């Protein structure tokens, strides 16, 4: 505190220089720098010591992952978080974990546990830091996925159908939304979500600002959607917030959409959809309010389609005749979604071509709660067996899963035959 700013910066730089000269140990430098970082009033000194600590971790783990040093520093951060929940000094632990995670120096589940304790804290800034750790890493995850992807008339209608089949295949094999490594690496996701919901969202005594409550809600809803958890009071908690008068109601509707998933009962989601329909999509409602409500309803219907009633869905699909472009496109999106998912609720005018042909021929089956695929044979195995029989017939002119070994070339041929059959069914 008492020394000159330039002199104390030179002292810290000289200590880091001695560490590079290997006069002093990394543990000794970190334990003589970190309490000064925590308790120093000087902002410039705090920033410089934080930068030197990050550089020390990068230099130490440049050669190989120094597990002892990483474990000791994670222990220090965990003890700093555990010592005082009301103290604001946990933001330094949060910031250090963010910087090392984005530098990919730390990838183990112990920083995830440390930020779990950071989320389960009394201090608003520490809660915000931990929630941002679990949330805002999705942008870096999308960047890493982009890097991994970079590393990796009738004829026109048939080409468009093939493009649609390729999009369906991408949906069948393309990474799940809201996917993040720390969110997977944390243990007991149901318990963590319940603890966050009871501590911050349920408690009216919590004086958190609305944006911070929205951040905690985003964390809880991404956990519920990603790990398919069941937190029933959350859906009753959204009830008072699903109003157009409520600020950031777009964020609330997005959170409810992310919370919804397949194993959520239709009984608990239906009052939410009915409330959104009544408050947002009504004759006195504005066009923007109706469009936002229909978009939120479409998101919830993508996540769980069984929430609807048939009459309500037909009523909402009839909003495509609206003179507003946003309401029109939202209603058409809802109609198209139910065209692929559950065309039986849709009217015979609104089903379209492929839906009516599928319902007439009998291939399309009703979607049910809890129903899972139970395919006794592989997909396209019949087509692969037919191709093998055709090859045998050609050889003569010139059951497969039980006995025959699945060659990789045979699997590729079966996939090509399945794609051709899908294109023929689309045509």
């Amino acid at each position: 505190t008492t020394l000159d700013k330039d002199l104390r910066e030179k002292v810290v730089g000289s200590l880091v220089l001695l560490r590079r000269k290997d006069v002093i140990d990394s543990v000794s430098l970190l334990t003589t720098l970190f309490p000064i970082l925590i308790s120093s009033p000087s902002k410039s000194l705090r920033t410089l010591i934080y930068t030197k600590i990050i550089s020390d971790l990068r230099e130490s783990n440049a050669k190989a992952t120094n597990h002892k040093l990483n474990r000791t520093i994670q222990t220090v951060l965990h003890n700093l978080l555990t010592s005082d929940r009301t103290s604001s000094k946990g933001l330094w632990a949060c910031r250090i974990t963010r910087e090392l995670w984005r530098r990919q120096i730390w990838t183990d589940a112990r920083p995830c546990d440390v930020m779990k304790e950071a989320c389960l804290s009394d201090n608003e800034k520490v809660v915000v830091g931990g929630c941002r750790f679990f949330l805002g890493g999705d942008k870096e995850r999308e960047e890493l996925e982009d890097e991994e992807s970079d590393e990796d008339k009738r004829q026109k209608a048939y080409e468009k159908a093939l493009e649609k089949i390729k999009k369906q295949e991408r949906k069948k094999h393309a990474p799940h939304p809201l996917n993040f490594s720390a969110l997977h690496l944390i243990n007991d996701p149901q318990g963590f979500a319940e603890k966050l919901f009871q501590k911050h969202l349920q408690n009216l005594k919590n004086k958190f600002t609305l944006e911070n409550r929205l951040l905690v809600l985003q964390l809880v809803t991404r956990l519920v959607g990603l790990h398919k958890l069941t937190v029933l009071p959350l859906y009753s908690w959204f009830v008072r917030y699903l109003t157009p008068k409520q600020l950031n109601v777009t964020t609330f509707l997005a959170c409810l959409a992310q919370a919804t998933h397949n194993l959520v009962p239709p009984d608990v989601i239906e009052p939410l959809v009915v409330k959104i329909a009544n408050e947002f999509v009504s004759e006195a409602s504005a066009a923007e309010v109706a469009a936002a409500g229909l978009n939120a309803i479409r998101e919830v219907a993508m996540r769980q389609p069984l929430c609807m009633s048939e009459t309500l869905l037909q009523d909402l699909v009839l909003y495509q005749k609206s003179k507003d472009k946003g309401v029109m496109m939202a209603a058409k999106g809802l109609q198209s979604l139910y065209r692929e998912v559950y065309p039986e609720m849709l009217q015979k005018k609104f089903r379209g071509k492929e839906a009516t042909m599928g319902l007439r021929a009998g291939e399309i089956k009703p979607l049910k709660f809890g129903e899972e695929e139970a395919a006794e044979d592989i997909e396209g195995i019949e087509l692969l067996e037919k191709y093998k029989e055709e090859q045998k017939k050609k050889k003569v002119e010139q059951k497969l899963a039980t006995t025959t070994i699945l060659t990789p070339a045979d699997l590729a041929k079966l996939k090509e035959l399945r794609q051709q059959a899908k294109l023929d069914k689309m045509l």
Partner: protein, 41 residues
């Protein structure tokens, strides 16, 4: 999007407070005190 109308219609945004009217007059102001840093001669 390159069209330039004489009057731009404000757009209602859901989940946000309503904008003040176009004819609204704001009388709030902030003042800063000028001080001369020179000692008595």
């Amino acid at each position: 999007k390159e069209k330039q109308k004489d009057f731009q219609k404000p757009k209602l945004k859901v989940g946000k407070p309503k904008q003040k009217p176009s004819n609204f007059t704001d009388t709030s102001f902030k003042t800063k005190s000028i001080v001369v840093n020179q000692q008595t001669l």
